[PDB]
Design a protein around this ligand. Sequence first.
Ligand SMILES: *[C@@H]1O[C@H](CO)[C@@H](O[C@@H]2O[C@H](CO)[C@@H](O[C@@H]3O[C@H](CO[C@H]4O[C@H](CO)[C@@H](O)[C@H](O)[C@@H]4O)[C@@H](O)[C@H](O[C@H]4O[C@H](CO)[C@@H](O)[C@H](O)[C@@H]4O)[C@@H]3O)[C@H](O)[C@H]2NC(C)=O)[C@H](O)[C@H]1NC(C)=O
Ligand SMILES: *[C@@H]1O[C@H](CO)[C@@H](O[C@@H]2O[C@H](CO)[C@@H](O[C@@H]3O[C@H](CO[C@H]4O[C@H](CO)[C@@H](O)[C@H](O)[C@@H]4O)[C@@H](O)[C@H](O[C@H]4O[C@H](CO)[C@@H](O)[C@H](O)[C@@H]4O)[C@@H]3O)[C@H](O)[C@H]2NC(C)=O)[C@H](O)[C@H]1NC(C)=O
Ligand SMILES: *[C@@H]1O[C@H](CO)[C@@H](O[C@@H]2O[C@H](CO)[C@@H](O[C@@H]3O[C@H](CO[C@H]4O[C@H](CO)[C@@H](O)[C@H](O)[C@@H]4O)[C@@H](O)[C@H](O[C@H]4O[C@H](CO)[C@@H](O)[C@H](O)[C@@H]4O)[C@@H]3O)[C@H](O)[C@H]2NC(C)=O)[C@H](O)[C@H]1NC(C)=O
Ligand SMILES: *[C@@H]1O[C@H](CO)[C@@H](O[C@@H]2O[C@H](CO)[C@@H](O[C@@H]3O[C@H](CO[C@H]4O[C@H](CO)[C@@H](O)[C@H](O)[C@@H]4O)[C@@H](O)[C@H](O)[C@@H]3O)[C@H](O)[C@H]2NC(C)=O)[C@H](O)[C@H]1NC(C)=O
Ligand SMILES: *[C@@H]1O[C@H](CO)[C@@H](O[C@@H]2O[C@H](CO)[C@@H](O[C@@H]3O[C@H](CO)[C@@H](O)[C@H](O)[C@@H]3O)[C@H](O)[C@H]2NC(C)=O)[C@H](O)[C@H]1NC(C)=O
Ligand SMILES: *[C@@H]1O[C@H](CO)[C@@H](O[C@@H]2O[C@H](CO)[C@@H](O[C@@H]3O[C@H](CO)[C@@H](O)[C@H](O)[C@@H]3O)[C@H](O)[C@H]2NC(C)=O)[C@H](O)[C@H]1NC(C)=O
Ligand SMILES: *[C@@H]1O[C@H](CO)[C@@H](O[C@@H]2O[C@H](CO)[C@@H](O[C@@H]3O[C@H](CO)[C@@H](O)[C@H](O)[C@@H]3O)[C@H](O)[C@H]2NC(C)=O)[C@H](O)[C@H]1NC(C)=O
Ligand SMILES: *[C@@H]1O[C@H](CO)[C@@H](O[C@@H]2O[C@H](CO)[C@@H](O)[C@H](O)[C@H]2NC(C)=O)[C@H](O)[C@H]1NC(C)=O
Ligand SMILES: *[C@@H]1O[C@H](CO)[C@@H](O[C@@H]2O[C@H](CO)[C@@H](O)[C@H](O)[C@H]2NC(C)=O)[C@H](O)[C@H]1NC(C)=O
Ligand SMILES: *[C@@H]1O[C@H](CO)[C@@H](O[C@@H]2O[C@H](CO)[C@@H](O)[C@H](O)[C@H]2NC(C)=O)[C@H](O)[C@H]1NC(C)=O
Ligand SMILES: *[C@@H]1O[C@H](CO)[C@@H](O[C@@H]2O[C@H](CO)[C@@H](O)[C@H](O)[C@H]2NC(C)=O)[C@H](O)[C@H]1NC(C)=O
Ligand SMILES: *[C@@H]1O[C@H](CO)[C@@H](O[C@@H]2O[C@H](CO)[C@@H](O)[C@H](O)[C@H]2NC(C)=O)[C@H](O)[C@H]1NC(C)=O
Ligand SMILES: *[C@@H]1O[C@H](CO)[C@@H](O[C@@H]2O[C@H](CO)[C@@H](O)[C@H](O)[C@H]2NC(C)=O)[C@H](O)[C@H]1NC(C)=O
Ligand SMILES: *[C@@H]1O[C@H](CO)[C@@H](O)[C@H](O)[C@H]1NC(C)=O
Ligand SMILES: *[C@@H]1O[C@H](CO)[C@@H](O)[C@H](O)[C@H]1NC(C)=O
Ligand SMILES: *[C@@H]1O[C@H](CO)[C@@H](O)[C@H](O)[C@H]1NC(C)=O
Ligand SMILES: *[C@@H]1O[C@H](CO)[C@@H](O)[C@H](O)[C@H]1NC(C)=O
Ligand SMILES: *[C@@H]1O[C@H](CO)[C@@H](O)[C@H](O)[C@H]1NC(C)=O
Ligand SMILES: *[C@@H]1O[C@H](CO)[C@@H](O)[C@H](O)[C@H]1NC(C)=O
Ligand SMILES: *[C@@H]1O[C@H](CO)[C@@H](O)[C@H](O)[C@H]1NC(C)=O
Ligand SMILES: *[C@@H]1O[C@H](CO)[C@@H](O)[C@H](O)[C@H]1NC(C)=O
Lengths: 428, 428, 428, 119
Amino acid sequence: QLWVTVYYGVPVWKEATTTLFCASDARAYDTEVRNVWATHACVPTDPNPQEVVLENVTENFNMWKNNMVEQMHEDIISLWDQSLKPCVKLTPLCVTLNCTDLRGEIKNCSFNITTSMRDKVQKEYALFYKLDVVPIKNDNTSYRLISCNTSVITQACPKVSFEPIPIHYCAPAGFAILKCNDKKFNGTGPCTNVSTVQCTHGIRPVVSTQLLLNGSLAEEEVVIRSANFTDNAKIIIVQLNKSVEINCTRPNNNTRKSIHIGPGRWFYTTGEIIGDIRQAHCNISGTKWNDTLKQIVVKLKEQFGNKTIVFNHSSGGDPEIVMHSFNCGGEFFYCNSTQLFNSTIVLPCRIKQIVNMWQEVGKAMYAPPIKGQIRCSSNITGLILIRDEIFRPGGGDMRDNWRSELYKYKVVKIEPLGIAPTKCKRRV
Amino acid sequence: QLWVTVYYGVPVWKEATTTLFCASDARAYDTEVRNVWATHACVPTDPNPQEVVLENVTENFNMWKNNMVEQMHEDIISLWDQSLKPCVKLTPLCVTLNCTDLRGEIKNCSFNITTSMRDKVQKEYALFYKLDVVPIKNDNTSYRLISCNTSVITQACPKVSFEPIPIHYCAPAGFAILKCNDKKFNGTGPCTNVSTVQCTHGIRPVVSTQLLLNGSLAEEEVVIRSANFTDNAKIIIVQLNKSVEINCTRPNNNTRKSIHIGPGRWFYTTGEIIGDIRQAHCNISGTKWNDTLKQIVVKLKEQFGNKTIVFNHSSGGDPEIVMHSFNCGGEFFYCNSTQLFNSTIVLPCRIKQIVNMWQEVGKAMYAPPIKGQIRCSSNITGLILIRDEIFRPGGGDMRDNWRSELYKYKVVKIEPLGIAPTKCKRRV
Amino acid sequence: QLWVTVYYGVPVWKEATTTLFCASDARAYDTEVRNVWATHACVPTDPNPQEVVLENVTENFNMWKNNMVEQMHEDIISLWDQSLKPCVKLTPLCVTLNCTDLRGEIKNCSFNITTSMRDKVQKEYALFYKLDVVPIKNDNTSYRLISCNTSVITQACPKVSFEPIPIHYCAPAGFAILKCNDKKFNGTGPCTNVSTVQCTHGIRPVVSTQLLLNGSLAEEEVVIRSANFTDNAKIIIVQLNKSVEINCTRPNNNTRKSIHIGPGRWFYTTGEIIGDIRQAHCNISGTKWNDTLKQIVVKLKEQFGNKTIVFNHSSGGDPEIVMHSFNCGGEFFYCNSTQLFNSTIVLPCRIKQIVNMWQEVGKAMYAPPIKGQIRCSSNITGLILIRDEIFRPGGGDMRDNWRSELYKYKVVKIEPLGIAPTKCKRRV
Amino acid sequence: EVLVQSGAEVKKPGASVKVSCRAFGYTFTGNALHWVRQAPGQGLEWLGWINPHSGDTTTSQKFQGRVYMTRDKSINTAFLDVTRLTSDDTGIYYCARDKYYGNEAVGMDVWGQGTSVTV
Ligand SMILES: *[C@@H]1O[C@H](CO)[C@@H](O[C@@H]2O[C@H](CO)[C@@H](O[C@@H]3O[C@H](CO[C@H]4O[C@H](CO)[C@@H](O)[C@H](O)[C@@H]4O)[C@@H](O)[C@H](O[C@H]4O[C@H](CO)[C@@H](O)[C@H](O)[C@@H]4O)[C@@H]3O)[C@H](O)[C@H]2NC(C)=O)[C@H](O)[C@H]1NC(C)=O
Ligand SMILES: *[C@@H]1O[C@H](CO)[C@@H](O[C@@H]2O[C@H](CO)[C@@H](O[C@@H]3O[C@H](CO[C@H]4O[C@H](CO)[C@@H](O)[C@H](O)[C@@H]4O)[C@@H](O)[C@H](O[C@H]4O[C@H](CO)[C@@H](O)[C@H](O)[C@@H]4O)[C@@H]3O)[C@H](O)[C@H]2NC(C)=O)[C@H](O)[C@H]1NC(C)=O
Ligand SMILES: *[C@@H]1O[C@H](CO)[C@@H](O[C@@H]2O[C@H](CO)[C@@H](O[C@@H]3O[C@H](CO[C@H]4O[C@H](CO)[C@@H](O)[C@H](O)[C@@H]4O)[C@@H](O)[C@H](O[C@H]4O[C@H](CO)[C@@H](O)[C@H](O)[C@@H]4O)[C@@H]3O)[C@H](O)[C@H]2NC(C)=O)[C@H](O)[C@H]1NC(C)=O
Ligand SMILES: *[C@@H]1O[C@H](CO)[C@@H](O[C@@H]2O[C@H](CO)[C@@H](O[C@@H]3O[C@H](CO[C@H]4O[C@H](CO)[C@@H](O)[C@H](O)[C@@H]4O)[C@@H](O)[C@H](O)[C@@H]3O)[C@H](O)[C@H]2NC(C)=O)[C@H](O)[C@H]1NC(C)=O
Ligand SMILES: *[C@@H]1O[C@H](CO)[C@@H](O[C@@H]2O[C@H](CO)[C@@H](O[C@@H]3O[C@H](CO)[C@@H](O)[C@H](O)[C@@H]3O)[C@H](O)[C@H]2NC(C)=O)[C@H](O)[C@H]1NC(C)=O
Ligand SMILES: *[C@@H]1O[C@H](CO)[C@@H](O[C@@H]2O[C@H](CO)[C@@H](O[C@@H]3O[C@H](CO)[C@@H](O)[C@H](O)[C@@H]3O)[C@H](O)[C@H]2NC(C)=O)[C@H](O)[C@H]1NC(C)=O
Ligand SMILES: *[C@@H]1O[C@H](CO)[C@@H](O[C@@H]2O[C@H](CO)[C@@H](O[C@@H]3O[C@H](CO)[C@@H](O)[C@H](O)[C@@H]3O)[C@H](O)[C@H]2NC(C)=O)[C@H](O)[C@H]1NC(C)=O
Ligand SMILES: *[C@@H]1O[C@H](CO)[C@@H](O[C@@H]2O[C@H](CO)[C@@H](O)[C@H](O)[C@H]2NC(C)=O)[C@H](O)[C@H]1NC(C)=O
Ligand SMILES: *[C@@H]1O[C@H](CO)[C@@H](O[C@@H]2O[C@H](CO)[C@@H](O)[C@H](O)[C@H]2NC(C)=O)[C@H](O)[C@H]1NC(C)=O
Ligand SMILES: *[C@@H]1O[C@H](CO)[C@@H](O[C@@H]2O[C@H](CO)[C@@H](O)[C@H](O)[C@H]2NC(C)=O)[C@H](O)[C@H]1NC(C)=O
Ligand SMILES: *[C@@H]1O[C@H](CO)[C@@H](O[C@@H]2O[C@H](CO)[C@@H](O)[C@H](O)[C@H]2NC(C)=O)[C@H](O)[C@H]1NC(C)=O
Ligand SMILES: *[C@@H]1O[C@H](CO)[C@@H](O[C@@H]2O[C@H](CO)[C@@H](O)[C@H](O)[C@H]2NC(C)=O)[C@H](O)[C@H]1NC(C)=O
Ligand SMILES: *[C@@H]1O[C@H](CO)[C@@H](O[C@@H]2O[C@H](CO)[C@@H](O)[C@H](O)[C@H]2NC(C)=O)[C@H](O)[C@H]1NC(C)=O
Ligand SMILES: *[C@@H]1O[C@H](CO)[C@@H](O)[C@H](O)[C@H]1NC(C)=O
Ligand SMILES: *[C@@H]1O[C@H](CO)[C@@H](O)[C@H](O)[C@H]1NC(C)=O
Ligand SMILES: *[C@@H]1O[C@H](CO)[C@@H](O)[C@H](O)[C@H]1NC(C)=O
Ligand SMILES: *[C@@H]1O[C@H](CO)[C@@H](O)[C@H](O)[C@H]1NC(C)=O
Ligand SMILES: *[C@@H]1O[C@H](CO)[C@@H](O)[C@H](O)[C@H]1NC(C)=O
Ligand SMILES: *[C@@H]1O[C@H](CO)[C@@H](O)[C@H](O)[C@H]1NC(C)=O
Ligand SMILES: *[C@@H]1O[C@H](CO)[C@@H](O)[C@H](O)[C@H]1NC(C)=O
Ligand SMILES: *[C@@H]1O[C@H](CO)[C@@H](O)[C@H](O)[C@H]1NC(C)=O
């Protein structure tokens, strides 16, 4: 006769969803002076994080079911919006613009400011990008801001930063994160090299389109993951084993004017350019890009055919879909990126100040003018591809970019209490 | 010698006040798209709720001391107000109206819109109810909105619903709800048929004046409860055993115009009427009403006298007190309700768009125009009466209507730990 | 052989920081009708608080490291700001003023109100203080409010009170407050007469400059504490053993006008004066002041020299630094306070309505006009001194005034669990 | 830590007197109190002691049934209750505290001022 016995501390778990919390590096605590994501309201990371490799644990993973992506979706948007609450409405500035060309990507516009200094009116001028404003059809000399008839746009408070600090996300007590350490593992299915993680590595909240950058290189080969590689409704995520260097710049030493439009209220606008007008652009090593791209094809052809023609020029969607984009030095560049795919490298880039947190509903944020020149560089580490076997760059939203990193982990809940039959009866 | 022994799990309690939480049915979770009260931020009800009848438990109840009413008071008001936070201020629309009659309950008013589209002005027209606007004494052609000199009124966001979903309120662990199941129990005093409830049934957040509807019929007789039936300062709550059917309508296929009064800002207003002008009205079965009313008197006369003349026409207070009211299809009807009491049935009704959550301080909400016709029907289940032995309908606020349902329950706290003398001494 | 044994309930602690919570007296709960700090959202104090004197406990205290001061800093500011959230913006009232003298501390200004009652304009007049407004340089007849070109000022909601109610701060379970009861203890170092306190006495949130008042008299001698009495970068806090009586008044029976500047919006302004113009002033017993001051010198000379000349006239900073200030009856007085120090008493005082919570960034609050006359009196209990051996009154901020009381206490955390070697081995 | 006693009394033989002693500056219940008397021309006579926490007392054999001690912790006060007063009861009635290290008498360093009773 076997008897019921209770065992506590049983090493089992069930898959579960909970909230992960942030953990900061060291510096982020004191970056509150400007940085939105690198907040002071965040505990530190573990200076000596542990990891345990499990011997016989094999589990199913599915990156497209990874709920951590939703948490990152909401957190970035919420934090970004919170930081803009005290910022300046540009509503009264949309009233009028009399424009000529800058002495036409950039317009030199004069304007009439409505009662400002209590009982006074004033006139000013500023430089505007053609991507932020549009002409009046029956004038062709007068302009308005594009988003004015839908919603409010504010100018980010000058004391702001979006530096993409690699914040870590940690599980609460009672929970653990299991990591798939199988370098050849695709987006779904079983993984045998599994380890227990209490907290993940830091992930930079990088915002970009048509580019995976500044992290997560592949294990000495191009690694491609997709929900199917079959269905045209699905997309392909490409990891490179080597990064490709890109150097971007906006070589215009610009200044900015503070315009007061009433006592107690003001905003900044692009002022005069110190020096000549230089085109924003980015330098991509051609050989590295195309040598890598040849290697990408070597991996891609495994699913799509050995003589299959792949990788054509960007096409489809509006200019923010078609052009490649990033915040270089905080400045927003929209690059044609067709040279990279002009065969199945320096690109021109355009500048725009009205931006979305990936995509807003109605509202938008205005990027204050930046004094001086823009210089930055980065590591190209991957691609997202569009099915047509022609592939084109782009597609998806922030969750596809978050997923491209989060695919390594899943969350489980520890279930330590259970029973089993024994030969031992309770004594009384 | 008896010894002190501790007993834990003792089935006793003391009366206590705590916070009850909501519980949703099934659909409400996904009604967030419009519905204010039927939120997504609410756990489900128990699909198989339990109830325990107690054998020897008799307790005192007092519906006028039932604190659950205060919780409902505050929750409805708060949730209603929260839903209106992002909605449109109608402040600039109060500037002017040049009115004539609709081609005078409804006025056809033209108006001058102040600078709107940045540097433009415009003129528009719309239809208005006489209950929302008033004339200027020295013009008699010009009008203003009634509430303009006290506060801000906003137009409810079009994506809104106030459907009165029957949300349940549940007690937290450590607490229980005791229910009085005595069908003959009045508003106060002991009740012997008592049962333990963890969570109550759902109660619809019905807003009305001069009518208890869509639930809680009496046990085959008219049941009347009052704090006293004596003091003229108290009121009488009447439950019917059978409901009386009422069919209401506003047979005017109306449309609405979206008026933009600046880029990024707009509101809806009543547009043209498709078809002729029909009067809003409600059809009450006369025989059912009066047959029931005769029965109401049969119960009422027990306290007030066998030959006593009761139930006269509505009188006292302003039009929202004197007229009967409800949101038919979401539209606000104010009905004379004098025919029902024209002896000690189809009523005309008036329409008003500025409304309160029972009664606001200063501020108010504006009910956006409703496209199409209004049709609804309902179950009359009870009355609230005013002392003069003439009785008249009306009186009270949301708490009297909430109390009329909540009277069945009280909250207690479980107190499981206690001691008693035993013959057994502790051994060491 | 000694064995490890666990002992729980060990009477030890370590210094620790936690959050203290408020506790109300009795009346404050129902002062919510006006009073900001004396809120309803606060539990009561212990009607019978306990204190335990410890026999052999000596600990180091440091008033300049007392973190309770930061909690009071933040709490007062936050609560004050919360109370002003629904109040009236005075932004449109800054547009114009045509001023002459009152029939020039007080100006009689007329003004043009911009479109107010929808399509109407109006003209009004009001009385203004020279400390709130400034002239236009090229007019010398026209005025503007001083803070208009930096930020928004609101008029406190009429239903407001800042009565400095002595709210107590209590430690949470697991924590305790240790008090230094050594009457001769300076601001830092060991204290042997130490007692355990669960909750402190009440401290009034008094706002003043150049004066410690209405509490905490010294133990029959002047008691002076300083971080150093050496370094000119440090300040001196002086406690008196006897208070000095001060009687303040603004003997002008003023009225106020409610000015509506649009339907739904209005503010109060100083109206006509009933009677003549009397100067605001304060009566300080001269003999008590100077007799005390002689005694202050007796204590001060211990550190600074027996024939050293001390205590000269106020000097340094802008008028809110140089003049003494308080809210008499809620009215803001700025007194010269030079007579008190005219030798190494009735002072004139000026009135100002724009105020800060000690010091705001950009924004400010406007004190609504007060109907009737101002009368109050108070207990002078101490001084803050500025090094030059001439001393002058003033310096510091709210934390110096909070610290001047909080110096008596420090917070510790109880650590009851520990181990020790025993002669007893565990039996199995 | 001080001990504060009530005032003086005048009684006739056969009467009774009650002398209080307040625990100022220390926990009332944290230190047992002694009562000592000194009649004119006399040395120090012990009457007894009371535990302010438990109410436990010990008295001199001389006063069994005559000298009682009580306490009320709500006011931090101990009391000496003396009956059957006679002329030998004229004297100063003092309250005092010991160290009670190890819960045993050591010697008393804290004394009240003493009150007089005339009989
Ligand atoms: C991929 O990774 C690359 C780098 O590996 C990132 O690009 C760099 O990002 C950092 C952070 O945003 C940039 O840092 C900026 O450098 C400017 C110049 O630095 C020089 O001068 C300063 C003067 O004191 C020296 O301290 C410093 O050592 C250098 O000598 C600074 O001026 C910038 O400061 C900004 O913020 C302060 C805050 O108040 C302002 O006052 C400044 O005016 C200014 O706004 C800042 O420190 C760096 O320049 C970037 N480029 C390069 C080539 O490294 C990519 O952004 C990253 N991409 C993604 C998507 O992650
Ligand atoms: C007392 O109880 C009665 C019923 O017992 C309540 O009255 C009914 O309340 C419901 C809910 O408010 C009303 O439902 C409305 O019905 C309209 C018409 O329904 C027909 O057409 C639709 C078209 O798809 C069919 O699906 C449906 O089966 C019917 O054929 C709908 O148009 C209404 O929808 C509204 O919301 C949506 C949300 O986006 C909008 O798009 C619509 O334009 C519209 O605004 C809604 O579904 C019902 O008509 C009411 N009347 C009757 C006679 O049943 C009383 O209100 C209740 N009173 C109290 C106080 O509790
Ligand atoms: C240092 O300590 C002194 C006192 O020791 C403080 O000065 C006093 O502070 C209190 C509280 O602020 C003042 O109280 C005010 O008294 C006015 C007159 O009182 C008489 O008339 C009323 C009429 O009913 C009688 O009830 C009362 O017994 C007296 O006969 C009141 O009118 C004031 O009320 C205010 O608030 C109400 C709320 O709605 C308004 O309606 C009123 O209009 C008014 O605004 C208030 O009660 C007292 O007058 C002060 N002076 C004196 C001499 O005591 C110091 O402020 C304090 N200083 C510091 C820094 O702590
Ligand atoms: C550690 O701090 C403790 C707390 O302050 C110290 O205890 C204090 O010790 C002093 C010593 O002189 C006592 O002062 C005396 O108090 C009596 C009280 O009687 C009067 O007041 C009461 C109040 O109701 C009234 O009822 C009476 O009729 C009297 O009017 C005075 O009479 C004396 O003159 C003198 O002031 C303190 O009272 C006492 N504090 C408490 C709370 O009892 C302790 O000594 C300190 N220890 C060290 C080592 O410094
Ligand atoms: C983009 O690519 C460049 C080039 O590979 C990356 O720069 C490299 O970053 C690593 C970071 O560890 C540097 O390593 C250094 O090693 C020395 C060895 O003692 C150590 O002391 C340093 O603290 C550091 O670890 C490496 O030198 C550096 N390479 C160059 C040429 O500077 C860059 O980090 C990549 N960017 C991103 C975002 O991945
Ligand atoms: C207003 O009064 C009408 C008339 O009494 C109420 O309509 C009735 O509602 C009940 C709800 O249970 C219907 O019962 C039905 O019984 C069948 C039996 O198999 C069941 O399958 C259905 O699911 C449902 O339970 C009843 O038929 C229905 N009467 C009519 C004539 O349709 C109405 O609910 C009352 N409204 C309120 C708010 O109380
Ligand atoms: C400013 O100084 C004056 C004068 O010393 C303070 O007034 C005094 O306040 C105390 C408060 O306890 C009054 O004590 C009273 O004693 C009687 C005795 O039976 C008691 O019944 C009362 O309830 C109260 O405790 C004292 O009489 C009073 N002095 C005068 C002349 O009225 C005043 O409180 C000081 N203000 C501040 C803020 O410290
Ligand atoms: C503001 O109004 C203008 C037109 O008055 C809108 O312009 C339209 O933009 C869409 C974008 O694809 C074009 O397809 C339409 O043809 C444009 N209209 C005209 C008349 O050319 C503009 O989009 C509106 N702004 C916002 C933010 O919605
Ligand atoms: C991956 O591709 C397969 C290919 O068959 C998908 O299968 C679909 O099956 C349904 C069943 O009737 C067909 O109607 C579809 O046309 C098939 N899709 C295709 C692309 O042919 C499967 O659903 C795909 N899985 C994912 C994740 O997309
Ligand atoms: C706006 O002002 C008008 C008058 O200028 C107010 O009208 C009064 O309304 C009350 C309501 O019972 C009447 O008794 C008064 O006689 C009306 N005044 C006049 C002159 O007829 C109106 O109430 C004000 N609006 C608000 C919202 O308070
Ligand atoms: C119910 O009615 C009784 C009737 O007597 C109320 O009694 C009141 O008693 C006071 C005592 O002096 C009288 O002054 C009142 O006039 C009485 N009221 C009436 C209506 O006569 C009792 O208070 C009432 N209870 C409730 C709940 O109203
Ligand atoms: C609003 O503008 C005026 C000047 O246009 C500012 O006045 C200055 O105030 C500072 C204060 O110390 C003086 O030193 C300057 O000399 C003043 N300027 C002039 C021209 O006299 C005023 O401070 C501004 N208001 C705010 C709130 O900043
Ligand atoms: C209190 O005064 C002493 C006096 O010496 C301060 O000592 C300082 O020591 C540094 C060391 O090089 C000197 O450079 C400073 O000049 C000294 N200060 C003075 C005023 O002479 C000590 O730091 C002071 N402590 C506090 C709390 O201020
Ligand atoms: C724009 O500038 C031209 C320059 O001559 C002027 O004629 C025209 O009226 C201006 N338009 C506005 C709107 O100011
Ligand atoms: C991953 O590889 C396994 C190998 O059997 C396959 O079954 C699974 O469908 C693959 N999933 C994806 C998304 O490629
Ligand atoms: C970017 O600039 C650095 C500067 O040393 C250079 O080494 C690197 O090769 C440049 N990258 C490209 C793509 O030109
Ligand atoms: C309810 O009925 C009981 C019966 O005795 C009576 O005592 C009590 O006052 C009644 N309460 C009300 C409110 O009618
Ligand atoms: C309301 O309409 C329904 C439709 O069938 C009808 O049965 C009911 O009797 C009507 N009620 C009244 C009061 O007319
Ligand atoms: C101020 O008053 C004087 C009085 O004559 C008047 O002349 C002047 O124009 C007024 N100024 C304004 C701005 O109204
Ligand atoms: C307080 O007095 C002690 C006495 O030794 C001294 O060491 C300490 O520095 C003094 N602290 C201050 C701030 O006066
Ligand atoms: C303040 O007025 C009171 C009124 O009785 C008076 O006793 C007190 O001495 C006055 N104080 C001063 C400083 O004059």
